[PDB]
PDB file of all heavy atoms in Angstrom:
ATOM      1  N   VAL B1048      24.894   6.603  -1.654  1.00 37.64           N
ATOM      2  CA  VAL B1048      24.419   7.242  -0.472  1.00 37.64           C
ATOM      3  C   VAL B1048      23.383   6.394   0.205  1.00 37.64           C
ATOM      4  O   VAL B1048      22.336   6.005  -0.429  1.00 37.64           O
ATOM      5  CB  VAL B1048      23.842   8.628  -0.770  1.00 37.64           C
ATOM      6  CG1 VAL B1048      23.413   9.315   0.541  1.00 37.64           C
ATOM      7  CG2 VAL B1048      24.874   9.421  -1.395  1.00 37.64           C
ATOM      8  N   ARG B1049      23.527   6.044   1.496  1.00 36.96           N
ATOM      9  CA  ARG B1049      22.708   5.183   2.203  1.00 36.96           C
ATOM     10  C   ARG B1049      21.337   5.851   2.485  1.00 36.96           C
ATOM     11  O   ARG B1049      21.056   6.175   3.677  1.00 36.96           O
ATOM     12  CB  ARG B1049      23.325   4.673   3.471  1.00 36.96           C
ATOM     13  CG  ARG B1049      24.781   4.406   3.419  1.00 36.96           C
ATOM     14  CD  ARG B1049      25.136   3.219   2.504  1.00 36.96           C
ATOM     15  NE  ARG B1049      24.315   2.075   2.920  1.00 36.96           N
ATOM     16  CZ  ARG B1049      24.703   0.808   2.749  1.00 36.96           C
ATOM     17  NH1 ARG B1049      25.891   0.522   2.288  1.00 36.96           N
ATOM     18  NH2 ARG B1049      23.820  -0.187   3.102  1.00 36.96           N
ATOM     19  N   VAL B1050      20.583   6.151   1.455  1.00 37.29           N
ATOM     20  CA  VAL B1050      19.224   6.615   1.580  1.00 37.29           C
ATOM     21  C   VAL B1050      18.430   6.104   0.418  1.00 37.29           C
ATOM     22  O   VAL B1050      18.941   5.876  -0.615  1.00 37.29           O
ATOM     23  CB  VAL B1050      19.174   8.180   1.625  1.00 37.29           C
ATOM     24  CG1 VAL B1050      19.115   8.723   0.256  1.00 37.29           C
ATOM     25  CG2 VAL B1050      17.967   8.612   2.426  1.00 37.29           C
ATOM     26  N   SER B1051      17.130   5.801   0.684  1.00 36.83           N
ATOM     27  CA  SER B1051      16.258   5.267  -0.337  1.00 36.83           C
ATOM     28  C   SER B1051      16.114   6.360  -1.437  1.00 36.83           C
ATOM     29  O   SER B1051      15.998   7.549  -1.128  1.00 36.83           O
ATOM     30  CB  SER B1051      14.923   4.909   0.210  1.00 36.83           C
ATOM     31  OG  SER B1051      14.020   4.671  -0.839  1.00 36.83           O
ATOM     32  N   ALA B1052      16.133   5.910  -2.689  1.00 40.29           N
ATOM     33  CA  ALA B1052      16.077   6.877  -3.787  1.00 40.29           C
ATOM     34  C   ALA B1052      14.880   7.697  -3.750  1.00 40.29           C
ATOM     35  O   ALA B1052      14.927   8.920  -3.940  1.00 40.29           O
ATOM     36  CB  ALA B1052      16.177   6.136  -5.148  1.00 40.29           C
ATOM     37  N   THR B1053      13.693   7.133  -3.511  1.00 42.53           N
ATOM     38  CA  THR B1053      12.460   7.923  -3.482  1.00 42.53           C
ATOM     39  C   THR B1053      12.330   8.772  -2.222  1.00 42.53           C
ATOM     40  O   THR B1053      11.513   9.656  -2.175  1.00 42.53           O
ATOM     41  CB  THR B1053      11.255   6.947  -3.556  1.00 42.53           C
ATOM     42  OG1 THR B1053      10.055   7.714  -3.299  1.00 42.53           O
ATOM     43  CG2 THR B1053      11.398   5.835  -2.590  1.00 42.53           C
ATOM     44  N   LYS B1054      13.134   8.483  -1.165  1.00 43.52           N
ATOM     45  CA  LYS B1054      13.142   9.330  -0.074  1.00 43.52           C
ATOM     46  C   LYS B1054      14.106  10.477  -0.187  1.00 43.52           C
ATOM     47  O   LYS B1054      14.124  11.403   0.684  1.00 43.52           O
ATOM     48  CB  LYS B1054      13.463   8.567   1.212  1.00 43.52           C
ATOM     49  CG  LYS B1054      12.189   8.194   2.045  1.00 43.52           C
ATOM     50  CD  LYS B1054      12.532   7.140   3.075  1.00 43.52           C
ATOM     51  CE  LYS B1054      11.254   6.893   3.864  1.00 43.52           C
ATOM     52  NZ  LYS B1054      11.580   6.066   5.082  1.00 43.52           N
ATOM     53  N   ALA B1055      14.945  10.471  -1.190  1.00 45.00           N
ATOM     54  CA  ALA B1055      15.815  11.621  -1.516  1.00 45.00           C
ATOM     55  C   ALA B1055      15.123  12.507  -2.565  1.00 45.00           C
ATOM     56  O   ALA B1055      15.410  13.710  -2.641  1.00 45.00           O
ATOM     57  CB  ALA B1055      17.167  11.189  -2.080  1.00 45.00           C
ATOM     58  N   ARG B1056      14.210  11.974  -3.340  1.00 47.50           N
ATOM     59  CA  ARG B1056      13.508  12.745  -4.295  1.00 47.50           C
ATOM     60  C   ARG B1056      12.425  13.643  -3.585  1.00 47.50           C
ATOM     61  O   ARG B1056      12.043  14.679  -4.085  1.00 47.50           O
ATOM     62  CB  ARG B1056      12.849  11.896  -5.323  1.00 47.50           C
ATOM     63  CG  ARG B1056      13.729  11.423  -6.459  1.00 47.50           C
ATOM     64  CD  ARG B1056      13.116  10.387  -7.227  1.00 47.50           C
ATOM     65  NE  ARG B1056      14.019   9.589  -8.064  1.00 47.50           N
ATOM     66  CZ  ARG B1056      13.803   8.327  -8.376  1.00 47.50           C
ATOM     67  NH1 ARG B1056      12.715   7.679  -8.087  1.00 47.50           N
ATOM     68  NH2 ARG B1056      14.776   7.720  -9.123  1.00 47.50           N
ATOM     69  N   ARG B1057      11.937  13.160  -2.418  1.00 47.47           N
ATOM     70  CA  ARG B1057      10.960  13.944  -1.673  1.00 47.47           C
ATOM     71  C   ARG B1057      11.557  15.243  -1.252  1.00 47.47           C
ATOM     72  O   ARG B1057      10.807  16.249  -1.112  1.00 47.47           O
ATOM     73  CB  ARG B1057      10.535  13.147  -0.512  1.00 47.47           C
ATOM     74  CG  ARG B1057       9.837  14.011   0.591  1.00 47.47           C
ATOM     75  CD  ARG B1057       8.928  13.127   1.403  1.00 47.47           C
ATOM     76  NE  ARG B1057       9.689  12.397   2.424  1.00 47.47           N
ATOM     77  CZ  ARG B1057       9.537  12.569   3.725  1.00 47.47           C
ATOM     78  NH1 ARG B1057       8.722  13.537   4.196  1.00 47.47           N
ATOM     79  NH2 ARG B1057      10.228  11.869   4.617  1.00 47.47           N
ATOM     80  N   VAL B1058      12.855  15.337  -1.016  1.00 45.66           N
ATOM     81  CA  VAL B1058      13.498  16.565  -0.525  1.00 45.66           C
ATOM     82  C   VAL B1058      14.018  17.352  -1.750  1.00 45.66           C
ATOM     83  O   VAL B1058      13.974  18.537  -1.746  1.00 45.66           O
ATOM     84  CB  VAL B1058      14.550  16.223   0.485  1.00 45.66           C
ATOM     85  CG1 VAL B1058      15.626  17.249   0.431  1.00 45.66           C
ATOM     86  CG2 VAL B1058      13.996  16.159   1.876  1.00 45.66           C
ATOM     87  N   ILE B1059      14.559  16.699  -2.787  1.00 45.95           N
ATOM     88  CA  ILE B1059      15.106  17.362  -3.941  1.00 45.95           C
ATOM     89  C   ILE B1059      14.064  18.236  -4.565  1.00 45.95           C
ATOM     90  O   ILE B1059      14.349  19.383  -5.031  1.00 45.95           O
ATOM     91  CB  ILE B1059      15.706  16.367  -4.930  1.00 45.95           C
ATOM     92  CG1 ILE B1059      16.949  15.695  -4.309  1.00 45.95           C
ATOM     93  CG2 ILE B1059      16.084  17.010  -6.182  1.00 45.95           C
ATOM     94  CD1 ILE B1059      17.614  14.802  -5.279  1.00 45.95           C
ATOM     95  N   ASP B1060      12.850  17.771  -4.584  1.00 43.31           N
ATOM     96  CA  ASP B1060      11.741  18.513  -5.270  1.00 43.31           C
ATOM     97  C   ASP B1060      11.570  19.904  -4.698  1.00 43.31           C
ATOM     98  O   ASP B1060      11.102  20.807  -5.397  1.00 43.31           O
ATOM     99  CB  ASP B1060      10.488  17.714  -5.220  1.00 43.31           C
ATOM    100  CG  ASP B1060      10.402  16.582  -6.177  1.00 43.31           C
ATOM    101  OD1 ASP B1060      10.932  16.737  -7.357  1.00 43.31           O
ATOM    102  OD2 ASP B1060       9.920  15.489  -5.810  1.00 43.31           O
ATOM    103  N   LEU B1061      11.968  20.092  -3.356  1.00 44.54           N
ATOM    104  CA  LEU B1061      11.751  21.418  -2.810  1.00 44.54           C
ATOM    105  C   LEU B1061      12.807  22.438  -3.299  1.00 44.54           C
ATOM    106  O   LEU B1061      12.647  23.577  -3.004  1.00 44.54           O
ATOM    107  CB  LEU B1061      11.933  21.328  -1.277  1.00 44.54           C
ATOM    108  CG  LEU B1061      11.184  20.235  -0.512  1.00 44.54           C
ATOM    109  CD1 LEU B1061      11.360  20.376   0.976  1.00 44.54           C
ATOM    110  CD2 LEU B1061       9.658  20.310  -0.863  1.00 44.54           C
TER     111      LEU B1061
END
Side-chain angles (χ1 to χ4, degrees):
Chain B
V1048 182
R1049 324 291 311 211
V1050 86
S1051 168
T1053 168
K1054 263 168 174 190
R1056 281 168 197 152
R1057 160 156 84 112
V1058 152
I1059 292 187
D1060 286 318
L1061 312 183

